[PDB]
Paper text:
The DNA damage response in mycobacteria is controlled by the heterodimeric transcription factor PafBC, a member of the WYL domain–containing protein family. PafB and PafC each feature an N-terminal HTH domain, followed by the WYL domain and a WYL C-terminal extension (WCX) domain involved in heterodimer formation.
In addition, we present a cryo-EM structure of full-length PafBC in its active conformation, bound to the transcription initiation complex, revealing the presence of ssDNA extending across the PafB and PafC WYL domains. PafBC inserts itself in between the promoter DNA and domain 4 of SigA, the domain usually contacting the −35 motif of housekeeping promoters. In the PafBC-bound transcription initiation complex, the HTH domain of PafB engages with the PafBC-specific −26 promoter motif, whereas the HTH domain of PafC interacts with SigA domain 4 (20). In the current structure, both HTH domains are accessible and interact with either the promoter dsDNA or the RNAP holoenzyme. This, in turn, stabilizes PafBC in its active, pseudo-twofold symmetric conformation. Combined, these results support a model in which RNAP-σA scans along the DNA, halts at the PafBC promoter, and subsequently binds to PafBC that has been activated by ssDNA binding.
Residue numbers in the entry:
A (entry chain X): 2 to 331
B (entry chain Y): 2 to 318
C (entry chain C): 805 to 877
Write the structure that this text describes.
DNA sequence: ACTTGTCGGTGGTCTGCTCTAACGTCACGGCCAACCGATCGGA
């Protein structure tokens, strides 16, 4: 009566400590736990199941002939591939790992992170989180990390397996869901926001999809290894280009009263004091960027911010203010 | 499964015990995150398994000195098991997500960790990658905040209050750093108002270090990690506003409540506001896209502000 | 291995490796000064006989003076 | 929840057996090449 864990430990120790390939019969006779098999077929099935389980854990078993003068095949575990190279971690790196190990919430991601941290600590370095004294408050309200957790896990699994992804994506809640089937290339984060990068098989273009919009139905399809993304493609550059398209728009002169509009004050490039209509302030020449965003920013401050140029922006602000002052009828 | 994880832990225990010559029971339990009985059972199971042939000088042997653990024969177990693809990918993703968060971790340390892990596992450019090779956007305030947190020293912060649209300089003692959503907030005790407030890194222009190592009151009274006294309270007024179909920008960046769908756009929602002026600015920003319904006083104030802005624009040139 | 040998190896810690010592030693009643070593390896494109991987020859030189028992004629 | 004895399938490798339909038909190769004595079987 030998437990399965003890049997697997004996098997892996025997494979690691033996410098020559071992056939099945020698393992049956020598390693404990394999001597209670009622029949040879039962032993073969048990050994195949145990070998499959060990191979699933990432242990690089190698199969080859026992000798150049013999035909029977044997088993051996390479010590070089089984052993990770040594790494030296400083206090800052240990603190970084300790802070990063307390982010995920899904059981699978938590288990994987715990196993990785355990292996890293067993490598020789020490990781401590109590010294830093930094915790996480929000655990179920994050729309980027907590909300996009299962989707990110599915995308990472598909990328590892090299398979295409089929999912439903909508540009906005007002719009309708659209089924999209693309070939994933990688995951790039920008300002703490995930952006899936891949090539669409329905439009034949490189698009970036925000993971918050994508639902949890990230079904992976296609044979493994069928995705071969070009190496010269820089995902970060594509994400940066997709984040912003207009470099600086145009130059607009805006007058703002002093002591307020600090958010707009920080965005000012050049400043010039000027008093108009008995109110002091400074005239600033700033960029345009998103026209709607600038119009909203100007209209939010009301009389605090007065637009001067261009005339189109002033007309738009005046129209919006008149619509607001109409009384809500329209 | 559970058995696979137990096997991995039992196989990796030996290198961990070899790394620390005299690791005690408490340190091992904390490192492995298991109870005392479970650790004892795992140690017993690992004790009686080793080299084939099964000789007492061949299998794994320990040396118990009181309540200490030491390895005398590793039986070929010299290095820990390698890292699988899933766990390495998760660690890299977590590190690259936390490197961009200001103040939670030093970017240099995160980059060094990423480089060392990639070198150890042999990853290539086909993995998750960041956006900026070198940020260089930190004004040095985050480093000062981290130093103040570590050394428990007085810190001066010039925080911009968005609700009141003003710059306030306060002297606070850092307590802890927490992450809420995608915006990390610094928790500290301010003697100016005698209350706990959360400050965001992007709203701090600069930080000044002072040599006043004074223990904050909350550690001596109450040091709850959350302390969300005003994050969500019934006393906060709520504004009911009509949102158009075109103005879909606010549906994601703000917590809209009581959302009702109407093809004609006759159904509205309700959102809380910290200050009346902030809500007025938020309403005026969208223009005609957002229509005010309730309360009547807020609508009257918005109309008066719009009329004043129109008069100011007419007077100005 | 005999139980006594296993016990001795366990006590002294010398691991029992499946290796047999076949070191070349100077034969009985011979000595001198090494003057030349020639090493042949298959990987260096050498016409070695099949099944042979390494072959090293060591030359030992000795000066013999006249002594009792040597034959003169 | 995890695991195992029992059941059945693929493909590869090593090993052995049976078959092939113009007509074919009794081997070179030869050492030995000494010398004396004793014994059994044909002429």
């Amino acid at each position: 009566a030998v437990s399965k864990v003890e049997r697997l430990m004996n098997l892996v120790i025997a494979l690691l400590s033996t410098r020559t390939y071992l056939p099945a019969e020698k393992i049956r006779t020598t390693v404990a736990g394999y001597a209670d098999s009622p029949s040879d077929e039962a032993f073969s099935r048990m050994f195949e199941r145990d070998k499959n389980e060990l191979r699933d854990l990432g242990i690089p078993l190698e199969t080859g002939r026992v000798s150049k003068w013999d035909s029977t095949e044997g088993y051996r575990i390479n010590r070089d591939s089984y052993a990770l190279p040594p790494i030296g971690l400083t206090a800052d790196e240990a603190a970084a790992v300790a802070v990063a190990t307390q982010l995920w919430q899904s059981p699978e991601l938590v288990t994987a992170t715990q196993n990785a941290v355990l292996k890293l600590r067993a490598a020789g370095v020490d990781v401590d989180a109590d010294g830093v004294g930094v915790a996480i408050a929000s655990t179920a309200t994050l729309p980027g990390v907590r909300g996009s957790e299962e989707v990110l896990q599915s995308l990472l699994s598909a990328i590892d397996e090299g398979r295409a992804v089929q999912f439903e994506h909508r540009p906005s809640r007002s719009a309708d869901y659209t089924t999209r089937t693309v070939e994933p290339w990688g995951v790039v984060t920008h300002r703490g926001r995930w952006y899936l990068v891949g090539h669409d098989r329905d439009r034949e273009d490189t698009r970036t999809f925000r993971l918050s919009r994508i639902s949890a139905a990230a079904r992976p399809i296609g044979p493994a290894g069928a995705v071969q993304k070009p190496q010269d493609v820089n995902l970060r550059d594509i994400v940066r280009r997709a984040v912003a398209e207009q470099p600086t728009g145009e130059r607009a002169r805006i007058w703002i009263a002093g002591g307020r509009a600090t958010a707009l004050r920080r965005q000012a490039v050049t400043s010039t004091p000027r008093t108009i209509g008995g109110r002091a302030g400074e005239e600033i020449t700033v960029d345009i960027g998103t026209w709607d965003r600038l119009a909203r920013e100007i209209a939010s401050y009301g009389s605090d911010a007065v637009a001067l140029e261009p005339s189109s922006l002033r007309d738009d602000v005046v129209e919006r203010l008149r619509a607001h002052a109409a009384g809500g009828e329209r | 499964s559970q058995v696979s994880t137990r096997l991995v832990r039992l196989l990796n225990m030996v290198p961990y015990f070899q790394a620390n010559p005299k690791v005690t029971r408490a340190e091992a339990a904390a490192a492995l995150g298991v109870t005392g009985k479970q650790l004892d059972a795992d140690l017993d199971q690992l004790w009686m398994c080793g080299l084939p042939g099964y000789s007492p000088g061949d299998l794994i042997d320990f040396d118990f000195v009181g309540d200490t653990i030491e390895v005398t024969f590793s039986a070929g177990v010299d290095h820990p098991l390698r890292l699988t693809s899933t766990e390495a990918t998760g660690i890299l993703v977590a590190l690259r997500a936390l490197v961009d968060v200001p103040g939670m971790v030093d970017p240099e340390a995160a980059r060094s960790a990423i480089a060392k892990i990639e070198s150890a596992v042999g990853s290539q450019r086909a993995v998750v990658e960041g956006i900026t090779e070198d940020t260089s956007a930190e004004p040095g305030a985050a480093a000062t905040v981290r130093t103040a947190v570590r050394e428990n020293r007085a810190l001066t912060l010039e925080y911009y209050s968005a609700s009141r649209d003003s710059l306030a300089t306060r002297t606070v003692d850092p307590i802890r750093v927490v992450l809420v959503g995608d915006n990390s907030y610094l928790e500290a005790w301010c003697r100016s108002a005698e209350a706990v407030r959360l400050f965001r890194f992007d709203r701090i222009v600069d930080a000044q270090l002072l040599d006043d190592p004074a223990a904050p009151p909350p550690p001596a009274v109450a040091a709850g990690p959350d302390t969300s006294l005003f994050d969500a309270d019934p006393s906060l007024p709520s504004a009911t506003l009509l949102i158009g179909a075109a103005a879909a920008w606010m549906f994601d960046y703000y917590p809209l409540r009581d959302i009702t769908e109407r093809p004609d756009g006759s159904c509205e929602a309700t959102m809380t506001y910290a200050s009346e002026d902030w809500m007025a600015r938020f309403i005026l920003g969208f223009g005609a896209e957002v229509q005010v319904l309730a309360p009547e006083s807020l609508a009257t104030r918005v109309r008066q502000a719009a009329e004043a802005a129109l008069q100011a624009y007419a007077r100005c040139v | 291995l005999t139980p006594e040998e296993r016990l001795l190896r366990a006590i002294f810690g010398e691991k029992a490796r499946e290796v047999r010592d076949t070191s070349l030693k100077v034969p009985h009643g011979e000595s001198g000064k090494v003057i030349g070593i020639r090493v042949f390896s298959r990987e260096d494109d050498d016409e070695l006989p099949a099944g042979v991987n390494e072959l090293v020859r060591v030359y030992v030189a000795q000066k013999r003076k006249i002594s009792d028992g040597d034959k003169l004629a």
